[PDB]
Amino acid sequence: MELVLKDAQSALTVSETTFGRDFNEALVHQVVVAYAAGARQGTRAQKTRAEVTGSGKKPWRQKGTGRARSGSIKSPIWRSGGVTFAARPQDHSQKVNKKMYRGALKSILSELVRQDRLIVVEKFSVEAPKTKLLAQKLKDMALEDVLIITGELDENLFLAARNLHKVDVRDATGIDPVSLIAFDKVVMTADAVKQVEEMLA
Amino acid sequence: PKIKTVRGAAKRFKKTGKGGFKHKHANLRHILTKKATKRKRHLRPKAMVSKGDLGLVIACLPYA
Amino acid sequence: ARVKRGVIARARHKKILKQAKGYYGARSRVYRVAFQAVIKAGQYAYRDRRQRKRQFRQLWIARINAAARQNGISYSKFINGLKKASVEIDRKILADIAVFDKVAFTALVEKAKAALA
Amino acid sequence: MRLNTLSPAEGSKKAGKRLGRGIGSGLGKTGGRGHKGQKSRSGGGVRRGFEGGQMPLYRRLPKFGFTSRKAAITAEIRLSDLAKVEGGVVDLNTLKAANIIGIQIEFAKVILAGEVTTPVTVRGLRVTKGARAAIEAAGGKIEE
RNA sequence: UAGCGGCGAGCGAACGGGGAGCAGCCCAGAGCCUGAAUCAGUGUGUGUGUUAGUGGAAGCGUCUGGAAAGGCGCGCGAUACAGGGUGACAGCCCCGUACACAAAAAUGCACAUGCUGUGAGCUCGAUGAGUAGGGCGGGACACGUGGUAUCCUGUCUGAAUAUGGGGGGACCAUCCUCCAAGGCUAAAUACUCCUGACUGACCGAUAGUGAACCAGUACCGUGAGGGAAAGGCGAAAAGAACCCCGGCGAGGGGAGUGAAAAAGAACCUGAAACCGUGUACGUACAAGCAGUGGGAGCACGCUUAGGCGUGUGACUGCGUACCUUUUGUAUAAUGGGUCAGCGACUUAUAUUCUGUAGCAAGGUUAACCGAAUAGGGGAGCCGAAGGGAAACCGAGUCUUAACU
RNA sequence: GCUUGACUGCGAGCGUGACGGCGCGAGCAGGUGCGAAAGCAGGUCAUAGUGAUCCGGUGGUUCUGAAUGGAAGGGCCAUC
Ligand SMILES: [K+]
Ligand SMILES: [K+]
Ligand SMILES: [K+]
Ligand SMILES: [K+]
Ligand SMILES: [K+]
Ligand SMILES: [K+]
Ligand SMILES: [K+]
Ligand SMILES: [K+]
Ligand SMILES: [K+]
Ligand SMILES: [K+]
Ligand SMILES: [K+]
Ligand SMILES: [K+]
Ligand SMILES: [K+]
Ligand SMILES: [K+]
Ligand SMILES: [K+]
Ligand SMILES: [Mg+2]
Ligand SMILES: [Mg+2]
Ligand SMILES: [Mg+2]
Ligand SMILES: [Mg+2]
Ligand SMILES: [Mg+2]
Ligand SMILES: [Mg+2]
Ligand SMILES: [Mg+2]
Ligand SMILES: [Mg+2]
Ligand SMILES: [Mg+2]
Ligand SMILES: [Mg+2]
Ligand SMILES: [Mg+2]
Ligand SMILES: [Mg+2]
Ligand SMILES: [Mg+2]
Ligand SMILES: [Mg+2]
Ligand SMILES: [Mg+2]
Ligand SMILES: [Mg+2]
Ligand SMILES: [Mg+2]
Ligand SMILES: [Mg+2]
Ligand SMILES: [Mg+2]
Ligand SMILES: [Mg+2]
Ligand SMILES: [Mg+2]
Ligand SMILES: [Mg+2]
Ligand SMILES: [Mg+2]
Ligand SMILES: [Mg+2]
Ligand SMILES: [Mg+2]
Ligand SMILES: [Mg+2]
Ligand SMILES: [Mg+2]
Ligand SMILES: [Mg+2]
Ligand SMILES: [Mg+2]
Ligand SMILES: [Mg+2]
Ligand SMILES: [Mg+2]
Ligand SMILES: [Mg+2]
Ligand SMILES: [Mg+2]
Ligand SMILES: [Mg+2]
Ligand SMILES: [Mg+2]
Ligand SMILES: [Mg+2]
Ligand SMILES: [Mg+2]
Ligand SMILES: [Mg+2]
Ligand SMILES: [Mg+2]
Ligand SMILES: [Mg+2]
Ligand SMILES: [Mg+2]
Ligand SMILES: [Mg+2]
Ligand SMILES: [Mg+2]
Ligand SMILES: [Mg+2]
């Protein structure tokens, strides 16, 4: 298993286990869905018939009026009444088994390699925290929508990338499954490839 | 919350290797003089809960 | 995720009321009544696809009987005669011939009578 | 591989039942509860073990036995566990250090389950007749 | 789980383990040397915050249009493409945003340094009595008096006090462990009337607060108390000068404004029930769930000049709504005046089974740590062994003196 | 006439019950009675003469025994 660099001209060597495995769609799907579920805030509520403001007085007597029997002004049948199954705040997070998480990342990375979406480089840097410099670097490399993964997250590249919405810059520790899929290309430094190699192995 | 064991059932049944339940036979507490030795001898060993009753026992003993 | 029903509910009610066009009173105007009317119209239509086949055969037979008797034979003998003559023309066609081509019908009767002879 | 081209495995995501949503569903009206009676009701149904008032099985049968406190602090060790300790000396502390038995276990028995292949010294533990022969056949020893 | 329990319904620990956070002291007293310590209080420095603020990049042409931020073309800023506004959707029009700065005055905090009280340390003592314990009655302990330890005490009593005393779940012995009857003590923990900022697979006017609106109002009630309905002209009021009918009306018709007035204030859209005017066809000898199958005629379209389409429907076969509940309903059993809107199998945690995915004799971590959906954390839990009430034995075990 | 088989441990197999249960049973081990012996005997010609569980009582049995030795209490067997 060989990965070639761009800015330096080399053929780096990585594992078939990480960067050469078959795409397990069902596993990747589960992990991606879990990741989106983990982003949910789950902050809402409605009022049950207990929580609607108003008295517990029976609106009219049980028998003799010719009306349907009533018990509470807060009945969910009534306008202004409670919500039958009123929401409470929820935790939507799912468990992802560690091995399933890591298995999904290996499937994703191997698929990026197969689809020619993983671009390995020796270095990726900018001289100053200037957006114009990074924009120039990316058009030089013929990239627009790109996830850039570095060993050490430098201030200059982070700051240069912030105002380009199609560009994101991570360290190797901050990889997530959705972002690997969502961006058109993934640029990894040779350093970052080693760190992801070690993390998954 | 956690399901609560029916504690009286836990005192009467024990789960066996293949997931059946053993119990002690009824009718060997008292009024023993009138009962034949043979009848009492056959009531002494533990017996397995019957097929019809396993559902009722399992409901009572979720942590067996 | 609160879902309001109005757009879908309107489309469903309108679908029924469109099928109730021409019905009397509340049956073409009021959803509750129109719905029952449309279901019943469907039940009758199902039944009457079967009844249509019965009613037309009854009509053809009555006309064949009239035409046969104008040519001196009953329906029941005419049909028996055609079967003995190995004529396989069905009642729709015989009734059509009885009205539109009386000379041809007469030829069928003579064939039937010859087979009975 | 895009966020709009991922699918779950076939059979992994069955749709839940939704009762009381019309005739065509097959669960309209009564919602699978049948007609009337206690089980049709909201909150309706009898408690576990209830048999309609007949003395239930868990009360018509006698209680038996007592619970041993000693059983809760006694463990069994497999032959497969003997290689998992550090240093090839199996005693109560080395088994606890290897997470084979719990901290509060005071007594342990080695039984003939799995296989021992390394030579090991078992110290202060009971050993079954069959486990003893297996340990000694693998070059081991048992110190009482 | 162990237990408690008309051993019913139910109630339900601890030991021990993993974490968060950690902090220890004083009096029951003199003496010695001294007031040094550490906390407070009250002053002034010293930063750093808070309560106003300041600067803050870069766009033009052309097309459609009432209007351009839209399309097309060619530029430019970005540590600023958070967000909001502007005549439709704006990085560059405006307000902001990133970033960089700012306080006369008051005030929080953290230091440092003055000052008032507090008095460190060291030898030598001392060591909480109507108390512990008990009898009676209750209560609390997961523990319902039970074989019931332990805690509290209304009532009656009542020690030993370090050579002494408490506890180790009836009780005794032994051993271990602790020192009651005096007191103080941060952090980890609980909550939000209120303030700021930010967020939402939360609502969007019958929803969301009862209350989007002058709502705890109107209104109801002697009172406590109960308690609504009710949002939207337009980009801009440019909110209709003037004329005409009318009662110097209401209301309307013109004119004018506007992209639009069938946006005219009873104002965005403008459904349905319900009520009309117009036109086609049917209908005054005809009996019933009002349709359906057949079907003439009439009217109006249409591309073979043909039929075809659309509306109507004379005449004719068949034909007793729907829901519910029932052995069984046209039923003269139930429910519905109609429309529109709302209105009922949910959520959490346990548990079992099925499917599916991962890993596999292993599988998986919880709290927590971590800026981390990562990573760490294997405390635990389930499984790989059972039998027996149990000791215990163990691929067996129990039964029995022993098994055919 | 003689006797204690109205035995103790078990039990192939079967009957009958939704279940709890109830019933029939040759044969095996131990020990026994009657018979010269083959044998027969685990009550009575058979089918009614009965009451789950809990709670507790009595005897037996160190199975358990909350620091340890005991004990209490619990279990198991017999029985009320
Ligand atoms: K960015
Ligand atoms: K059902
Ligand atoms: K333009
Ligand atoms: K803007
Ligand atoms: K006292
Ligand atoms: K002591
Ligand atoms: K209210
Ligand atoms: K309201
Ligand atoms: K008709
Ligand atoms: K009835
Ligand atoms: K009635
Ligand atoms: K489930
Ligand atoms: K599964
Ligand atoms: K056996
Ligand atoms: K014998
Ligand atoms: Mg509400
Ligand atoms: Mg984790
Ligand atoms: Mg007994
Ligand atoms: Mg909505
Ligand atoms: Mg209409
Ligand atoms: Mg059905
Ligand atoms: Mg019903
Ligand atoms: Mg019924
Ligand atoms: Mg039922
Ligand atoms: Mg209820
Ligand atoms: Mg009864
Ligand atoms: Mg462990
Ligand atoms: Mg600016
Ligand atoms: Mg507009
Ligand atoms: Mg003291
Ligand atoms: Mg005490
Ligand atoms: Mg006392
Ligand atoms: Mg006492
Ligand atoms: Mg007392
Ligand atoms: Mg008490
Ligand atoms: Mg004591
Ligand atoms: Mg409201
Ligand atoms: Mg509205
Ligand atoms: Mg006027
Ligand atoms: Mg309009
Ligand atoms: Mg508008
Ligand atoms: Mg309007
Ligand atoms: Mg007429
Ligand atoms: Mg007449
Ligand atoms: Mg009539
Ligand atoms: Mg009829
Ligand atoms: Mg009836
Ligand atoms: Mg009928
Ligand atoms: Mg009737
Ligand atoms: Mg009637
Ligand atoms: Mg009726
Ligand atoms: Mg009724
Ligand atoms: Mg009615
Ligand atoms: Mg076992
Ligand atoms: Mg006799
Ligand atoms: Mg008899
Ligand atoms: Mg009791
Ligand atoms: Mg003891
Ligand atoms: Mg003790």
Beta strand pairing call for A11-13 and A2-4: antiparallel
Using a CB cutoff of 8 Å and minimum separation of 24, what contacts does A153-162 make? A154/A125, A155/A129, A156/A125, A156/A126, A156/A127, A156/A128, A156/A129, A157/A124, A157/A125, A157/A126, A158/A129, A159/A129, A160/A126, A160/A128, A160/A129, A160/A130, A160/A131, A160/A133, A160/A134, A161/A131, A161/A134, A162/A131
Expressed in angstroms, the distance from the first to the final Cα of chain B is 18
| Burial degree of A156 (CB within 10 A; 0-12, 13-18, 19+) | middle
Residues ≥6 apart with Cβ < 8 Å to C22: C28
CA angle, corner D14, sides to D12 and D19, nearest 5?
165
Rounded to an integer, what distance in angstroms lies between the CA atom of residue D61 and that of residue D49? 13
Q: Are D137 and D121 in contact (CB under 8 A)?
A: no
DSSP C14-74: HHHHHHTTT--GGGGT-HHHHHHHHHHHHHHHHHHHHHHHHHHHHHHHHHHHHHHHHTT--
Q: Could you tell me how many CB contacts below 8 A there are between chain A and chain D?
A: 26
The topology under which CATH files domain A2-200 is Ribosomal Protein L4; Chain: A; (3.40.1370)
Residue of A111, A116, A181 for testing the chain D interface, max D β-carbons within 10 Å: A181
Q: Are D1 and A104 in contact (CB under 8 A)?
A: no
Rounded to an integer, what distance in angstroms lies between the CA atom of residue A143 and that of residue A186? 10
Helix (H, G, I), strand (E, B) or coil at B21: strand
Rounded to an integer, what distance in angstroms lies between the CA atom of residue C30 and that of residue A161? 63
Facing residues of D142 across strands? D122
Facing residues of D127 across strands? D110
DSSP C99-112: HH-HHHHHHHHHHH
Residue C70: C-alpha distances to residues C73, C85, C100, C105 (Å): 8, 20, 15, 10
Rounded to an integer, what distance in angstroms lies between the CA atom of residue C94 and that of residue C83? 13
Secondary element (H or E) of residue B23: strand B21-23
Residues ≥6 apart with Cβ < 8 Å to D76: D108, D109, D110, D111, D113
Beta strand pairing call for B13-15 and B47-48: unpaired
Closest CA in chain B for residue D51: B56
| Burial degree of D111 (CB within 10 A; 0-12, 13-18, 19+) | middle
Closest nt to residue D62, judged CA to C1'? F53
Q: In this complex, do B24 and D57 lie within 8 Å of one another by their Cβ atoms?
A: no
Domain of C67, in residue numbers:
1-117
Rounded to an integer, what distance in angstroms lies between the CA atom of residue C87 and that of residue B15? 83
DSSP D48-72: TT--SSSPPHHHHSPP-----TTGG
The experimental technique behind this entry is cryo-EM
Displacement of CA B41 from its chain's centroid (Å): 17
Total domains in chain C come to 1
Q: Are C91 and C59 in contact (CB under 8 A)?
A: no
Closest approach of D43 to chain A, Cα-based (Å): 15
Facing residues of A167 across strands? A146
Sign of CA dihedral C49, C55, C57, C60: negative
Displacement of CA A80 from its chain's centroid (Å): 39
In angstroms and rounded to an integer, the radius of gyration of the C-alpha atoms of chain C is 25
Chains that touch C (3 or more CB pairs under 8 A): none
Extract the tokens encoding A115. Answer: 């689809």
Chain E positions with any atom < 7 A from a protein CB: 1-5, 7-12, 15-17, 77-82, 199-211, 216, 225-229, 271-274, 289-294, 311-313, 317-318, 321-322, 324-326, 336, 338-352, 355-359, 361, 363-366, 371-381, 384-396, 399
Extract the tokens encoding A118. Answer: 């993983």
Rounded to an integer, what distance in angstroms lies between the CA atom of residue D132 and that of residue D141? 8
Facing residues of D46 across strands? none
Beta-sheet strand order (sheet of D126-127): D74-77, D107-110, D126-127
**C51 C-alpha vs ligand 43 centroid, how far in Å?**
30
The answer to whether strand F lies under 7 Å from the CB of residue B47 is yes
CA of D129 to C1' of E276 (A): 107
CA of A47 to C1' of E232 (A): 28
Of residues B14, B15, B36, B12, the one with CA closest to residue B25 = B12
Chain F positions with any atom < 7 A from a protein CB: 6-11, 17-23, 25, 42-43, 49-56, 64-66, 73-80
**A72 C-alpha vs ligand 38 centroid, how far in Å?**
27
Using a CB cutoff of 8 Å and minimum separation of 24, what contacts does D102-107 make? D102/D75, D104/D72, D104/D73, D105/D73, D105/D74, D105/D75, D106/D73, D106/D74, D107/D70, D107/D73, D107/D74, D107/D75
The half-sphere exposure of D55 on its side-chain side, counting CA atoms within 13 A, is 5
Q: Which residues numbered 33-52 in B keep a CB inside 8 Å of some CB on D?
A: 46, 49
Length of chain A: 201
Rounded to an integer, what distance in angstroms lies between the CA atom of residue D119 and that of residue D139? 5
In the block, tokens 């507490």 appear at: B29
CA of D55 to C1' of F61 (A): 33
Neighbours of A11 (CB within 10 A): 9
Displacement of CA D78 from its chain's centroid (Å): 17
Q: In this complex, do D2 and A181 lie within 8 Å of one another by their Cβ atoms?
A: yes
Secondary element (H or E) of residue C95: helix C91-100
Q: Are A108 and A101 in contact (CB under 8 A)?
A: no
Neighbours of C43 (CB within 10 A): 10
CA angle, corner D2, sides to D1 and D3, nearest 5?
130
Eight-state DSSP code of residue B30: S
Helix (H, G, I), strand (E, B) or coil at D81: helix
DSSP D4-56: TS--PPTTS-PPPP--SS-STTS--TTTT--SSSGGGSTT--PPTT--SSSPP
In chain D, residues with a C-beta closer than 8 Å to the C-beta of B14 are: 65
Using a CB cutoff of 8 Å and minimum separation of 24, what contacts does D44-50 make? D48/B6, D48/B56, D48/B59, D48/B60, D49/B6, D49/B9, D49/B56, D49/B59, D49/B60
Q: Are A184 and A148 in contact (CB under 8 A)?
A: no
Chains D and C touch (3+ CB pairs under 8 A): no
The answer to whether strand F lies under 7 Å from the CB of residue B46 is no
Expressed in angstroms, the distance from the first to the final Cα of chain C is 86
Full 3-state SS string of chain A: CEEECCCCCCEEECCHHHHCCCCCHHHHHHHHHHHHHHCCCCCCCCCCCCCCCCCCCCCCCCCCCCCCCCCCCCCCCCCCCCCCCCCCCCCCCCCCCHHHHHHHHHHHHHHHHHCCCEEEECCCCCCCCCHHHHHHHHHHCCCCCEEEEECCCCHHHHHHHCCCCCEEEEEHHHCCHHHHHHCCEEEEEHHHHHHHHHHHC
